[PDB]
């Protein structure tokens, strides 16, 4: 379908490894944007503020290794824009990351 | 396949690994990796370090 929502866990440690201290969290934002870009194919990607806060919870350089996010493709037929579908990425708190798949959550 | 040695930790030093060390008194010691050397030279008791064989035998573990 085209309004699907899914649940992901992101190896931020994998995508951050090598970048300098004071770029770790902003590059983490860029890499989660590109993750959603390549997942949903939606040029418009919006990051929830609670997710940004969850990224920066340990300062600029002690970025968490693993983040459990949730992507949601919604209709952009609310105004005249070149892109008709966008992806909200919402932070999903978890107590552990062991044995977590990518699971298709309902609406 | 040569003569087998046991480290500061009592491990299994296969040939072509680690280092040996000599002292003025004549004692000869062999070590598996630089962690064992650094532990030994700091005068750290092997029986107190958690992961060595001597600790395991002192605590009956396994």
């Amino acid at each position: 379908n085209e309004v699907v929502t899914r649940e992901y866990t992101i190896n931020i440690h994998k995508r951050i490894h090598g970048v300098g201290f004071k770029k770790r969290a902003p590059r983490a934002l860029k890499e989660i944007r590109k993750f959603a870009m390549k997942e949903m194919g939606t040029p418009d990607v919006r990051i929830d503020t609670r997710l940004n806060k969850a990224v920066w919870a340990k300062g600029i350089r002690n970025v968490p290794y693993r983040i459990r996010v949730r992507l949601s493709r919604k209709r952009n037929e609310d105004e005249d824009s070149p892109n008709k579908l966008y992806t909200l990425v919402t932070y999903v708190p978890v107590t552990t990351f062991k044995n977590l798949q990518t699971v298709n959550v309902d609406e | 396949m040569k003569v087998e040695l046991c480290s500061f930790s009592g491990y299994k030093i296969y040939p072509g690994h680690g280092r040996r060390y000599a002292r003025t008194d004549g004692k000869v010691f062999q070590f598996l990796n630089a962690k064992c050397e650094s532990a030994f030279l700091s005068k750290r008791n092997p029986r107190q370090i958690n992961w060595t064989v001597l600790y395991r035998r002192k605590h009956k573990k396994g």
């Binding site: - | 299994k12 296969y14 690994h17 598996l32």
Partner: protein, 50 residues
């Protein structure tokens, strides 16, 4: 080839197969498992399979 460095019969005694991804100290998995015995992950795995 005419030197004694060539024309050498090679008869190997031991072939090292420890981990090159760090300081390996075990040749093979069987020797490692015998050396260090059951672990926590093996304990819970044998719990799942009873």
């Amino acid at each position: 080839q005419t030197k004694r460095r060539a024309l050498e019969k090679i008869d190997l005694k031991f072939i090292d197969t420890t981990s090159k991804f760090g300081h390996g100290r075990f040749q093979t998995m069987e020797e490692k498992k015998a050396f260090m015995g059951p672990l926590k992950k093996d304990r819970i795995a044998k719990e799942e399979g009873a």
